[PDB]
Amino acid sequence: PIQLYAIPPSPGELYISLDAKLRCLVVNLPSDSSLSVTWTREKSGNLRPDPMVLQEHFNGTYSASSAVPVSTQDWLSGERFTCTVQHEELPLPLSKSVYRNTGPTTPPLIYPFAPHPEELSLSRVTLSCLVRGFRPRDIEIRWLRDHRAVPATEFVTTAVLPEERTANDGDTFFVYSKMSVETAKWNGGTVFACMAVHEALPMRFSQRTLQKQA
Amino acid sequence: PIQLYAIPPSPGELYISLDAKLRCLVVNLPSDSSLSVTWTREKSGNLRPDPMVLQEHFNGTYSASSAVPVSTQDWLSGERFTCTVQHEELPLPLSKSVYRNTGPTTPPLIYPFAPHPEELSLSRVTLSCLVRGFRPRDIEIRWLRDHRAVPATEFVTTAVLPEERTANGDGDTFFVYSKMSVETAKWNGGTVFACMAVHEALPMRFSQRTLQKQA
């Protein structure tokens, strides 16, 4: 029942910090008996994977994870990266590939919402952002407050879903993100921003500002 | 890998249509050979399961589902219900339990959003609803248009999540977001829409907010 997954980097690590890693996860290993996880890149050059990590599980199994740095330029070029697992119980090696989307691509539309008027009596108000119409589904949302990054613990973003069949090359997707802010700060004119990070955007990210209107 | 899932009744079934059912889903069945799905409860009383339903799939496997009517009162009571599956490939019976969360409750707050002004030049606009601040996490969202029900295929609601710690919210409060794309002409023409939340903590177990284009 050995399963192998090749996990793509997050849009944030690819397009904001440019320090992305590919990750390979192997599950349901009966042991590390002749276990090996190896990476291959399609083009000339080398890869330098991090040390592989073995975890024990309560269900009596083992999992192995291996991460490898990938440059954003290499990712964007369309290069394919392949992880392969060998094991005593594996008659044939298992491989999975990961690479930048080659299917249809469509940039996200970003719609910021100010607090509902009925929230303004409360000590905190909700700023939110609908991001929709995009392909592929991989997207990251970040927030800024007075031009500085907001910690992830201070907002929440919904898991990406296909849009309803009426909303519009296949499904498009959407996410919604919201951030509770102090009412005094909102009323004070602080500028906030919701940022989408997505491969189909001109510069790979775009932001829309929110600020109280006079 | 035969798997078993126990599925609670929805708030709509519990409070609106009053036809709640517990459901059991078995996946990856190689066959119906010696298949049996049985239910048990905690209090004295005979459960009356619906007949089992089987489906053959393209991936070669079979799935089975079993539904059992449950009264809203019995569900709200916190009684635990268990579905058990036996099959020739199972050395021992497989079981899962389902029951209501009986912790503290808090009613949702519903905030409807008209289309962003930038959407009005498109052929469709998005109506949406943020529903937040509630406990427990079980909730159902429905939409109406001119007092008529909108089919579930015409809108999407996000999977419920805990709110961020600053929200702030007992323990965690939860939120969902629901949106419905409508023809811009229907919005501009003055149709009255409504987003409705069904939740156990509301006085009448539901509440709604209307959305209509303003002058």
Ligand SMILES: *[C@@H]1O[C@H](CO)[C@@H](O[C@@H]2O[C@H](CO)[C@@H](O[C@@H]3O[C@H](CO)[C@@H](O)[C@H](O)[C@@H]3O)[C@H](O)[C@H]2NC(C)=O)[C@H](O)[C@H]1NC(C)=O
């Ligand atoms: C035994 O117990 C472990 C407990 O974790 C199970 O491993 C989990 O297996 C699932 C898939 O079967 C993994 O989900 C995967 O998540 C990645 C993203 O992280 C996603 O890309 C894949 O689609 C996949 O769904 C999960 O990560 C993994 N948990 C960990 C941390 O290793 C295992 O399945 C159990 N085996 C049995 C049958 O008892």
Ligand SMILES: *[C@H]1O[C@H](CO)[C@@H](O[C@@H]2O[C@H](CO)[C@@H](O[C@@H]3O[C@H](CO)[C@@H](O)[C@H](O)[C@@H]3O)[C@H](O)[C@H]2NC(C)=O)[C@H](O)[C@H]1NC(C)=O
């Ligand atoms: C072969 O195809 C069938 C049908 O697509 C697959 O059956 C499905 O299996 C998944 C889980 O692996 C089920 O998802 C479950 O959905 C319930 C809905 O309440 C959810 O609560 C659970 O958390 C779970 O994720 C899915 O319902 C089930 N059947 C259907 C109708 O899709 C099956 O997995 C495939 N088998 C293999 C091994 O290829």
